[PDB]
Structure 1
Amino acid sequence: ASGMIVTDAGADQPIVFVNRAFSTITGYAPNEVLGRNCRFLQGPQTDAATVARLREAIAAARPIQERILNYRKDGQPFWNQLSISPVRDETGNVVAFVGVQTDVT
């Protein structure tokens, strides 16, 4: 099952909702992640270039897909097939971002 994260659009994109599969994949409970930027999932072997591409896409509110190395709460690495998209209203304002995670280890 794939994880889902919803973040606010502004102000460094704090998490506002996660589904159950997010906890299955990452080992974090909702309480442990709400209000935080998702970058706590990264760690020392995460590819910096990939991170850069995410950062640039989010700042532009452009959809992006990447395979990124992430880490469970306990420190166990896993490969995340990650897809992020803005949620826009019909005037084009970005209301949120949604990300989908699949553990492809």
Structure 2
Amino acid sequence: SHMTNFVLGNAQIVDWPIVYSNDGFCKLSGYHRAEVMQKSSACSFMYGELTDKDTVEKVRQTFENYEMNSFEILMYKKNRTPVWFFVKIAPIRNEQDKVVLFLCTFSDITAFK
């Protein structure tokens, strides 16, 4: 399922703001739900020096183009600890086939990277 840690982003507003974050994501990221809500579901609030900038660009284009893609990406927990995440980005469509949300699912792959 990989539903341990996830957020939902609003596909129909610029920057795809997070409209839901589960307890797992808050724990994994180090950020309280209050701090995550309305941030970009691209999670650029977690990017930093070591984050691969080509990967950041591919992640942006995935949202921009309403695509389904997944990435390994070096991000930073709230306390500045660097962590390798596996991130899956998946558009969610309504019954009229319009993309309304993005489901973004995350796991820590630091141990295996």
**Do these two structures clear the TM 0.5 threshold for a shared fold by scoring above it?**
yes
Q: TM-score, normalised to structure 2's length?
A: 0.88
**2:101 aligned with 1:99, yes or no?**
no
Report what 2:60 is aligned to: 55
Other-structure match for 1:8: 10
Distance 1:53 1:90 in 2: 28
In structure 2, what is the Cα distance between the partners aligned to 1:42 and 1:15? 16
Q: Alpha-carbon deviations, 1:23-57, whole Å to 9, x = none?
A: 12110010011111121011111001111111111
Extract unaligned runs of 5+ from structure 1.
Answer: none
Map 1:65-76 → 2, pairs under 5 A = 65-76=70-81
Shift in Å, 1:90: 2.9
Distance (Å, rounded) in 1 between the aligned partners of 2:17 and 2:63: 13
Aligned residues: 105
What percentage of residue pairs aligned between the two structures are identical? 32
Alignment map for 1:9-88 (pairs within 5 Å): 9=11, 10-37=13-40, 38-88=43-93
What value does the CA root-mean-square deviation take over the aligned residues? 1.1
Is 2:92 the counterpart of 1:90? no
Unaligned runs of 5+ in 2: none
